[PDB]
DNA sequence: TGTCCCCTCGCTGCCGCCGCC
RNA sequence: AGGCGGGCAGCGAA
């Protein structure tokens, strides 16, 4: 269905229209989602249920990832290319949805959005998230949106990484919490079981309704309790195991010698254990890291008397995750936490603050460098667009919030009519404001400096600073200078810099009291997914500006 | 103009790699490369204005910035862009430096003393081909007074050149051509008595004569530059870039001595743990080793002979070149932002992290048990009254009062810093 | 150069022009300078004044009358100041702003110039060239004439971008009329298109890649096309300031890069605006600023005014020797304008002081082709016009030189020259497009 | 005969290199 | 000893 340039596996298709009858991926994948469901219906026995219904869906994700792999005989990279291209413009539809409801979209993920609803109850919650579903799901006759999960209380780490508690209804309208993770160094196989239970035990408390400091001291209480257990060797060894699966044969690591899994799988392999490429390597660092690795298998034999460096494990495999765990939290003492778990505090000490910065007078600076943007381009005026389609003008302001335009994941799209700026459309229009302000810039008006004259005209003296008027001593000046022209220029460069856009440092377009004042502001990280999605339309936008800013 | 005539006129204006710097520059050149090239020539000269102001040796000096020329203006390069780098900078300087008589004179004295050693490097092929490019003697006009001009000239031969040995004064006097000019241009050698005079010539110490020639007329184009510069007030770019740059203006101890107990007698309980340490594991880890580098930069220790002594002191040179000497030159402010760093007081030294095994640093009235504070007590002769005073002092967590105390019964009286300790136990020595 | 407007350098060129006119009068009228005094200081003797025709009030009303203009004297003769002109005792006149005038009178009271004739400006000199030259472009001719279509733009209508009565103009000279060279002037991309202006760039479908700049689309819509222009014709391309392939918006506009068009070398040249060359023994003036259009004259006289409009245009033109002599320029009100680089009217003025042998200078105005002063006069239209009805461009076809059949005129002196005559060989027909 | 499990993004630890305070 | 820049390898996740 999807016409596509054979002769360039790059190049991206556009969707085939409605007239075209539905082919043969959408009906294939649509009778596997039928599959799926009623696999889903026949859970409503369940763990292997489950084990078939994920398998199914394991089935129709390799459908549209075999549109991916070079070596599968039905190789189609701008397929691939055009779906995930459409599950980016879906994801931007569905928060930008988001913020014109104002609500607070804290995170997403390649199919999901979470949304921070403000409200102290689940069901207070669960409305807005209906409602959110109905309006979403009238945009699409078959893709279809739907909760997933209910958080009460959620902690993001970072990206892909975050923890929280999920509501669980249960038969008589009764409502339980569970600890949720995902991708945390708890999770991790790299990571003692140690880690893993200590780790459950501070988010347990953290997530749970106590007061923030009281529960910062629990933690540190239990953390203390920890180190003294993991000091005294108080704690079966079973809890001290490592898991890293090698993906090349231990032979072929060059920096080997630092990692402690290649060491241990070496040792294994003299010792008459067959240790290959995908093996699993298990471990546990014995009192360099690498030369005091050893197997559990040897370490659980007494014979050997090997004890687990509390060092080591005590700073590494508990101290830093739960400092990961902890950066956000509010009163968050790292140095409280190292000194709980015996840690040197200098260490922690520079990444509170940034260490002292330390200079002398550097007069590497130009004062054209020194110059504030803001100051440079107060005294510009604002790009003015017209939409090809419904006529309208605004002013353009970068990746900013609007209530005429919006930076759409395809491109730049009026709010009024909808419509898509083709790169064209937006290049001329800069090119013919810079063009008029060229214009006017050689139109050669000239602007006495006295205050009682003031007079302005295009006639110049063969004296060029003697103001024409009869006994006036005011100083002739253009009225368009050119280092005013120059800021102009810049100023439209900045407009499509994606640098500048990111960190948000373009000059407002509107002024608090002004009636077109953006009623939803952008939020940062959209502002970085958008830079980065339209690169290309901002570098050509910012190119149209370098062809006069090179010349001036 | 075209690209080509411009590059014959500058093959033509450095046929000799030196420039008199007579005819201003032609060309179109961005404001980006004009901030930058007058912000690295204003570096060089800054550097060589610090020189001046300690007192440094030429030798020395030319040793700090022969780097300085590899990395800001490179010199010595066939490439025209280095040149022309040359070339604008030192025009865009004159611009800057002319507006006040003081500027122009500092500006001046550091131009002539960069084209010194500018001309101390170029080679005796090419020196000869710059002077030639002030009238040179004949063949004969020299045969004649060979023995005189050699007299004169043998001195100046053997303490400028090193030519210790006569042959090799001889060799570069057969060599050397000589220039005809009068006394009165040339008196300062007439009174040090440098140059052959006869019947009110003076026959050429040619740098001096060169120098001095350099500093006339560049004072006299600062003077015109500045006399032309209201017309040149018309322009909105450089003004503010010609302020900015003219506000940008505005051995005993030696790599044996300090192992010597003379030296060592004066140093503090901290110096002698670093320095014992450095002795008995020929290497020191990073706080150590910067706290005793700016103690010994502080006593007055060279970057040479710094380099020397901790080059010795770890007993490959690869990996100390790659590694190490760059931060001991760093220390002394040589390269990046060129800090030269203030010596570790007490303050600083307590305020770094506390040492641990095989760490030296800190201060050992702090970091040492008394036993061993004891012990080195009883190997300075110090009685045991003492030894529970300074004992106590350390036990307050007052271990400046105890340094202090310890330096009074080993030889204004509170004592903060290293440094004031090796000083004031010099100056008891003088 | 750069897109720089420095004051001084502009009041310089603006006091050189009166310096160099003045000079020029006394040298042909064989006067000496001390016969040339201040006019803006009272004076009992009658005196020569030579400056340029500038308002009486420097915020004056855009329509101006003998009675509302003053001269403004040169550092040197007058320190600059500017007088009242009386023109009571003239019956015949043409002013316009800008002009330089060289003139005789006598400031009776101090406050006004009282004019008694006016000295008009000498025609420079026509182009010379020698007998061998001459023979050799004969044999360049192999005896048929010489053949020169000259084009403006802009190409395409106002409502679409079609450039299909371009390719007809293709197709016809290169099957039918078969030049020599072909001169087309700009704007080609037009910045003050009305579609480009509202950014209502269309969706091309014939086009592969669609394009992302205006210099893209006149690389996939101009260029091609231009490649289909026979090898045989040699064209050259003269920019017009509203040109937005052009990076230099300013009057005079140096010459587009060949390379930056994709346009092969083999038989393609582009020279700038203002531009002078030479075909065989033929010299051309070209500028792409209407003049024609934006000269608003000030008239007195029955016979002056008897005359025809382009004539006088083109007789003060030759006069002041500058291709565009009006000061300050032309402005659409802010749209365009005539955007004069003042610092820059050197470049303007006629190189080596030679009357152009063909001075085109495209106009708004209808096309027209007239013999003045001995030097043709030439304004093939735009290509299009607004609605896209067939424009006009004009074919010159001139007898090839020959020294036997009398129409070179020999010029006296020991070195044997020839001036071209070209009213005497040159026709010009304006087709319609 | 010889095969495979989408790339791509962001996160953490380790290793070697470079400049700096 | 510390922050940054580019490179490799290991791994959790969409
Ligand atoms: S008090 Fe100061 S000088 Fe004395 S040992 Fe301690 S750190 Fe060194």
Redesign the pocket.
């Known amino acids: 269905t999807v016409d596509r340039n054979k002769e360039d596996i790059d190049e991206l298709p556009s969707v085939p229209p409605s007239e075209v009858d539905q082919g043969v991926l959408p009906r294939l994948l649509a009778n596997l989602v039928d599959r799926r469901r009623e696999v889903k219906k026949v859970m409503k026995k369940r763990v292997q249920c489950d084990i078939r219904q994920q398998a199914l869906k394991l089935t129709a994700?390799?459908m549209?990832?075999?549109?991916?792999?070079?070596?599968?005989?039905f190789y189609a990279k701008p397929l691939?290319m055009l779906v995930?291209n459409k599950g980016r413009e879906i994801l931007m539809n569905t928060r930008q949805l988001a913020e014109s409801m104002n609500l607070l979209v804290v995170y997403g993920?390649?199919?999901?959005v979470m949304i921070d609803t403000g409200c102290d109850n689940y069901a207070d919650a669960i409305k807005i998230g209906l409602g959110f579903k109905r309006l979403v799901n009238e945009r699409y006759r078959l893709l279809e949106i739907d909760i997933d999960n209910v958080f009460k209380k959620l902690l993001l780490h970072?990206?892909?990484?975050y923890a929280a508690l999920t509501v669980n209804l249960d038969k008589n309208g009764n409502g339980t919490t569970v600890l949720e993770v995902?991708?945390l160094?708890m999770?991790?196989?790299?990571f003692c079981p140690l880690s893993r239970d200590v780790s459950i035990h501070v988010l347990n408390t953290i997530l749970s309704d106590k007061d923030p400091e009281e529960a910062l001291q629990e933690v540190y209480d239990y953390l203390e309790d920890i180190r003294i257990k993991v000091e005294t060797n108080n704690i079966r060894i079973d809890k001290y195991k490592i898991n890293?699966?090698?993906?090349?044969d231990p032979k072929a690591?060059?920096?080997g010698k630092?990692?402690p899994?290649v060491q241990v799988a070496l040792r294994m392999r003299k010792a008459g254990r067959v240790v290959k490429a995908?093996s699993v390597i298990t471990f546990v660092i014995t009192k360099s890291?690498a030369e005091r690795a050893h197997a559990l298998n040897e370490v659980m034999i007494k014979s050997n008397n090997l004890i687990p460096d509390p060092q080591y494990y005590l700073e590494?495999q508990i101290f830093?995750p739960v400092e990961?765990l902890l950066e956000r939290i509010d009163s968050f003492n790292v140095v409280r936490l190292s000194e709980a778990l015996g840690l040197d505090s200098?260490?922690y000490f520079?990444?509170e603050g940034?260490?002292?910065?330390?200079?002398?007078i550097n007069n590497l600076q130009p004062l054209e460098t020194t110059i504030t943007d803001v100051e440079r381009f107060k005294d510009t005026v604002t790009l003015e667009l017209s939409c090809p389609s419904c006529d309208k003008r605004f002013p353009f302001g970068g990746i900013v919030s609007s209530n005429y335009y919006r930076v759409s994941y395809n491109g730049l799209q009026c709010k009024h009519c909808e419509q898509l700026f083709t790169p064209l459309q937006l290049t001329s229009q800069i090119e013919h404001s810079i063009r008029a302000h060229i214009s006017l810039y050689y139109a050669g008006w000239l602007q006495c400096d006295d205050s009682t004259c003031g007079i302005v005209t295009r006639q110049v003296s063969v004296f060029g600073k003697r103001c024409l008027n009869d006994g006036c001593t005011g100083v002739m000046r253009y009225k368009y200078s050119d280092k005013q022209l120059y800021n102009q220029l810049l100023y439209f460069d900045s407009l499509f810099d994606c640098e500048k856009n990111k960190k948000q440092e373009l000059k407002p377009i509107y002024l608090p009291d002004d009636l077109d004042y953006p009623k939803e502001q952008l939020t940062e990280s959209s502002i970085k997914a958008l830079t980065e999605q339209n690169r290309e339309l901002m570098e050509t936008g910012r190119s149209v500006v370098q062809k006069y800013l090179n010349d001036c | 103009s075209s690209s080509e005539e411009e590059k014959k006129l500058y093959a033509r204006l450095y046929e000799s790699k030196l420039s008199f710097y007579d005819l201003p520059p032609q060309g179109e050149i961005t404001l980006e490369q004009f901030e930058i090239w007058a912000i690295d020539r204003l570096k060089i000269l800054l550097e060589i204005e610090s020189c001046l102001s300690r007192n440094k040796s030429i030798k020395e000096i030319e040793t700090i910035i022969k780097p300085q020329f590899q990395k800001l203006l490179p010199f010595n390069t066939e490439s025209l862009e280095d040149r022309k780098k040359d070339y604008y900078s030192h025009f865009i300087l004159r611009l800057c430096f002319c507006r006040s008589k003081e500027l122009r004179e500092k500006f001046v004295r550091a131009e002539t003393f960069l084209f010194k050693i500018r001309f101390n490097m170029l080679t005796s092929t090419d020196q000869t081909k710059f002077v030639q490019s002030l009238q040179f003697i004949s063949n004969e006009e020299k045969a004649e007074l060979s023995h005189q001009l050699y007299q004169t000239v043998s001195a100046s031969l053997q303490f400028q050149l090193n030519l210790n040995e006569e042959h090799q004064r001889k060799q570069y006097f057969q060599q050397e051509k000589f220039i005809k000019l009068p006394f009165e241009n040339v008196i300062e050698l007439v009174g040090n008595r440098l140059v052959f005079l006869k019947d009110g010539y003076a026959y050429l110490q040619q740098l001096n004569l060169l120098s001095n020639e350099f500093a006339s007329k560049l004072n006299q184009e600062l003077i015109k530059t500045y006399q032309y510069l209201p017309r040149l007030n018309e322009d909105d770019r450089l003004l503010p870039i010609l302020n900015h740059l003219s506000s940008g203006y505005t051995d005993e101890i030696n790599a044996q001595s300090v192992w010597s107990e003379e030296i060592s007698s004066n140093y503090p309980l901290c110096i002698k743990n670093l320095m014992e340490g450095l002795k008995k594991n020929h290497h020191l880890?990073?706080?150590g080793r910067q706290q005793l580098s700016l103690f010994l930069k502080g006593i007055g220790l060279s970057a040479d002979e710094a380099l020397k002594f901790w080059s010795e002191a770890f007993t490959t040179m690869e990996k100390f070149n790659?590694?190490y000497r760059?931060?001991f030159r760093?220390n002394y402010?040589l390269?990046?932002?060129?800090?030269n760093?203030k010596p570790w007081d007490c303050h600083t030294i307590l305020s770094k992290?506390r040492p641990g095994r095989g760490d030296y640093h800190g201060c050992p009235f702090r970091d040492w048990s008394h036993e061993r504070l004891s012990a080195e007590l009883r190997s300075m002769k110090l009685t045991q009254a003492q030894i529970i005073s300074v004992l106590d002092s350390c036990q307050k967590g007052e271990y400046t009062i105890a340094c202090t105390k310890v330096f009074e019964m080993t030889h204004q009286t509170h004592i903060a810093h290293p440094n004031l300790y090796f000083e004031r136990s010099r100056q008891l020595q003088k | 150069r750069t897109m720089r407007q420095n004051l001084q350098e502009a009041s310089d060129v603006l006091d050189d022009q009166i310096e160099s006119f003045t000079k020029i009068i006394q040298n042909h009228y064989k006067l000496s300078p001390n016969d040339f005094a201040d006019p803006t200081i009272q004076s009992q003797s009658e005196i020569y004044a030579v400056g340029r025709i500038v308002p009486d009030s420097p915020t004056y009303d855009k329509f101006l009358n003998p009675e509302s203009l003053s001269l403004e004297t040169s550092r040197m003769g007058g320190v600059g100041r500017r007088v009242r002109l009386d023109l009571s005792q003239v019956n015949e006149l043409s002013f316009f702003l800008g002009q330089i005038v060289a003139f005789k009178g006598k400031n009776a009271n101090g406050d006004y110039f009282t004019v008694n004739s006016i000295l008009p400006l000498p025609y420079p000199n026509s182009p010379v060239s020698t007998s061998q030259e001459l023979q050799e472009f004969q044999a360049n001719l192999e005896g048929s004439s010489l053949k020169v279509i000259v084009t403006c733009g802009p190409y395409f209508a106002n409502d679409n971008f079609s450039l299909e009565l371009l390719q007809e103009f293709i197709d016809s000279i290169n099957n039918e009329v078969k030049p020599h060279v072909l001169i087309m002037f700009g704007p080609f991309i037009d910045i003050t298109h009305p579609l480009i202006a509202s950014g209502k760039l269309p969706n091309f479908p014939q086009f592969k890649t669609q394009p992302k700049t205006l210099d893209e689309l006149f690389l996939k819509l101009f260029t091609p096309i231009l490649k289909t222009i026979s090898p045989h014709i040699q064209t050259v391309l003269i920019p017009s300031t509203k040109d937005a392939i052009s990076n230099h918006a300013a009057y005079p506009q140096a010459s587009l890069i060949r390379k930056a068009l994709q346009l092969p070398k083999r038989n393609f040249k582009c020279m700038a605006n203002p531009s002078s060359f030479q075909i065989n023994e033929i010299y051309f003036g070209c500028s792409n600023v209407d003049t024609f259009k934006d000269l608003k004259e000030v008239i007195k006289g029955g016979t002056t005014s008897s005359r025809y409009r382009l004539d006088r245009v083109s007789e003060h033109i030759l006069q002041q020797r500058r291709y565009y002599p009006i000061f300050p320029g032309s402005i659409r009100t802010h749209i365009s304008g005539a955007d004069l680089d003042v610092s820059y009217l050197g470049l303007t003025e006629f190189v080596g002081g030679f009357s152009p042998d063909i001075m085109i200078i495209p106009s708004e105005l209808q096309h027209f082709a007239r013999v003045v002063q001995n030097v043709v006069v030439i304004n093939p239209g735009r290509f299009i016009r607004a609605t896209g009805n067939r424009g006009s461009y004009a074919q010159i076809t001139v007898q090839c030189p020959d020294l036997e059949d009398g129409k070179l005129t020999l010029v006296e002196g020991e070195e044997p020259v020839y001036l071209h005559n070209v009213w005497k060989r040159a026709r010009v027909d304006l087709i319609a497009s």
């Open positions: 994700n390799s549209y990832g075999c549109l991916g792999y070079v070596n599968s005989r691939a995930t993920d390649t199919d999901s970072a990206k892909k990484k995902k991708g160094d999770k991790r196989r790299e890293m699966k090698l993906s090349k690591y060059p920096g630092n990692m899994a995908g890291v590494k830093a990961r200098k260490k520079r990444r940034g260490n002292n910065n330390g200079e002398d | 880890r990073y706080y790659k590694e760059y931060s760093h402010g390269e990046g932002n060129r800090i760093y992290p």
